[PDB]
Design a protein around this ligand. Structure first.
Ligand SMILES: Nc1ncnc2c1ncn2[C@H]1CC[C@@H](COP(=O)(O)OP(=O)(O)OP(=O)(O)O)O1
Ligand SMILES: [Ca+2]
Length: 625
DNA sequence: CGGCTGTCATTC
DNA sequence: CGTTGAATGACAGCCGC
């Protein structure tokens, strides 16, 4: 029927409690809430290291101590020294978000997050939930959970459907279920040779990602609203530039209103459709296909961009600057990492614009460091290529790379016209796009499309590239055959993705899976290296500079009852590592970043790292030896 | 009426 | 039928009790 424990009886109860507690290695933790949403209103923590029994830590209802208990919890929760114990929670980053932000305890020890293990098993799985896990993992204990009906986030976040059961009940049941279960999961991971890869790599990723997600990132509405009115100007100005040719009752917003003049005065449609086809016109016809490019691009650049940023921005009182907070995601099929409150990964790239007298805009320039700071970006110069170079061992690429400076510049140099350089970056980026598209098996006719040429000509070009490098086709078809013999691919860490569709009869699921093996291995391992560089950098950053960790921890200083120095984790562009750093340590910071990104693990080629630096989000790069 | 599958914008 | 991969958000249809 019942077993739980309030840990308050005068003293002795609580005392033998911490006395046991301090000794234990593996243990589990969960909290709960009630109302009011940040929030500091949290009922109390709960802990269990095993068995049907569980311990609760309040904040019946007896008394002696007050601030005391919180101190004990602190002392218990961190790694004095040399004493290495681990701790588990359903999801992670937000529980640590609370412990730091709500009550001001910076938890530091070894960490184990089970939904991440569950994911590490099945990258294609959908977003594990409690009920799903205790179902798939802890059966004989399960039925009890069914008194509640919530599974998305933890039992604190499930506060509503739990509200009829809410209290210590939720924190405790989450604690114990999580403990037996995570014991089972860890059994499963060690049952493969993934455990070193789990505890000693990806949980640290969740960690680094977390103190980031606390860092947030800097923003200035003055810039946002500046380029805002810029864009409004080009909006209406292009409206009249358009209706100078005709105009007939027009507004761009409606595609059916567009059907009128488009289908009428021009007549070339190879609902109807819109975009690709009119780009096909943007090459050739001058009379306002590209007016539609600039207009449509503008609208996307405002409504799906300026609005949400100007919405869900917040401020740090501790800075005097406003910043915005993403969320750690992971759960990518490859193992790459994304962010959603907005996603600032896809934020628009700078582009030029017409009103000599030209102009240019950057939606992204509005991200600033703190007043004293500057932003450091460390980009991998063509990492995945190097990876494929390692696995195919194509010596030819190893040489074309170990020499070539942005080998895209060479590909461009021999392609649309011969120029040695003075290659515009719009072109450079188009080239990068076409090529990376090819490597994973771009379609022949579509290649003919992006370059603008005929089918068989483009196909003879692809065949030409198999001829140029066969180590690729070797590695390629071979790894396909392995995916049939096994049914999964494997990234270098030993993390592996299950491709079900590779064996399927339907030609499409089979084709898609063939390429999918390729991209999954290379992008997956790419993201792996990146994670490793992140945790390296941050772990060094941690003790090496004796100041402290990240922006949440200030707020932690106010609850635990100054100058600004360090550099802080901000973002990952998957090969790019994004830091803001005080303009002090920026050189030290830079050489550390270069160092740990190049020092992840050694392989067939050296990984050059271009490192850009400067005020705001648009920038310059140089450093010397 | 909510899961499910797809076009259509942007990234890397 | 659907032949670059990984993403995020909208939006629109389709089932199917
Ligand atoms: N269109 C695409 N399709 C597939 N994979 C792609 C891709 N674009 C990028 N990747 C993968 C493979 C590369 C990786 C990051 O590519 P960057 O855009 O950062 O360009 P990088 O190659 O690093 O050259 P740099 O510009 O840095 O000099 O993401
Ligand atoms: Ca790059």
């Amino acid at each position: 029927s019942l077993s739980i424990i309030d840990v308050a009886s005068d003293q002795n109860l609580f005392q033998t409690f911490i006395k046991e507690w301090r000794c234990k290695k593996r243990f589990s933790i969960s909290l709960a809430c009630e109302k009011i949403r940040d929030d500091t209103l949290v009922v109390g923590l709960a802990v269990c290291w095993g068995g049907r029994d569980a311990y609760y830590f309040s904040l019946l209802d007896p008394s002696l101590t007050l601030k005391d208990r919180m101190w004990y919890l602190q002392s218990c929760l961190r790694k004095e020294s040399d004493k290495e114990c681990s701790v588990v929670i359903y999801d992670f980053i937000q529980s640590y978000k609370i412990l730091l932000l709500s009550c001001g305890i910076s938890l530091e020890q070894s960490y184990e997050d089970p939904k991440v293990a569950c994911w590490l098993l099945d990258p294609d799985s959908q977003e594990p939930t409690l009920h799903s896990i205790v179902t798939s993992f802890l059966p004989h204990e399960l039925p009890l959970l069914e008194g509640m009906e919530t599974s998305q986030g933890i039992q604190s976040l499930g506060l509503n459907a739990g509200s009829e059961h809410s209290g210590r009940y939720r924190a405790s049941v989450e604690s114990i279920l999580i403990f037996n279960s995570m014991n089972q999961l860890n059994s499963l991971l060690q049952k493969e040779n993934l455990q070193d890869v789990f505890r000693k790599v990806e949980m640290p990723s969740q960690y680094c990602l977390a103190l980031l997600e606390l860092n947030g990132i800097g923003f200035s509405t003055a810039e946002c609203e500046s380029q805002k009115h810029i864009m409004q100007a080009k909006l209406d100005a292009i409206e009249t530039q358009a209706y100078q040719l005709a105009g007939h009752s027009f507004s761009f917003t409606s595609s059916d209103d567009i059907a009128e003049v488009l289908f009428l005065e021009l007549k070339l449609p190879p609902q109807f459709s819109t975009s690709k086809d009119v780009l096909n016109k943007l090459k050739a016809l001058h009379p306002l296909p590209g007016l539609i490019l600039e207009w449509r691009r503008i609208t996307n650049a405002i409504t799906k961009v300026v609005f949400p940023l100007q919405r869900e921005k917040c401020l740090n009182p501790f800075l005097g600057m406003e910043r915005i907070y993403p969320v750690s995601q992971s759960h990518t099929a490859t193992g790459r990492i994304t962010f959603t409150e907005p996603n600032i990964q896809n934020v628009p790239r700078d582009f030029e614009i017409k009103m000599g007298m030209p102009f240019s805009i950057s939606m992204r320039h509005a991200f600033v460091p703190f007043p004293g700071g500057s932003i450091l970006a460390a980009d991998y110069s063509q990492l995945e290529l190097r990876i494929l170079a390692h696995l195919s061992h194509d010596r030819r690429l190893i040489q074309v790379l170990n020499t070539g400076a942005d080998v895209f510049r060479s590909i461009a140099a021999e392609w649309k016209m011969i120029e040695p350089e003075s290659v515009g970056d719009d072109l450079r980026q188009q080239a990068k796009q076409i090529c990376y598209g090819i490597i994973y098996g771009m379609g022949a006719k579509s290649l003919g499309e992006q370059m603008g040429i005929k089918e068989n000509d483009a196909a003879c070009y692809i065949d030409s590239f198999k001829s140029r490098y066969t180590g690729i086709n070797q590695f390629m078809t071979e790894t396909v055959k392995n995916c049939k013999r096994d049914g999964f691919v494997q990234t270098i860490l030993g993390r592996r993705r299950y491709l079900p569709g590779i064996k399927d009869n339907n030609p499409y699921r089979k084709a898609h899976a063939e390429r999918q093996a390729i991209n999954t291995i290379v992008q997956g391992s790419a993201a792996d290296i990146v994670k490793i560089a992140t945790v390296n950098i941050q772990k060094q950053l941690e003790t090496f500079h004796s100041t402290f960790k990240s922006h949440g921890h200030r707020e932690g200083m106010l609850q635990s009852d100054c100058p600004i120095r360090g550099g802080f984790f901000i973002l990952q562009l998957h090969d790019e590592l994004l830091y803001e750093v005080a303009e002090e340590d920026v050189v030290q910071v830079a050489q550390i970043v270069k160092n740990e990104m190049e020092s992840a693990v050694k392989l067939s080629v050296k990984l050059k790292v271009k490192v850009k630096i400067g005020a705001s989000w648009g920038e310059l790069k140089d450093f010397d030896v």
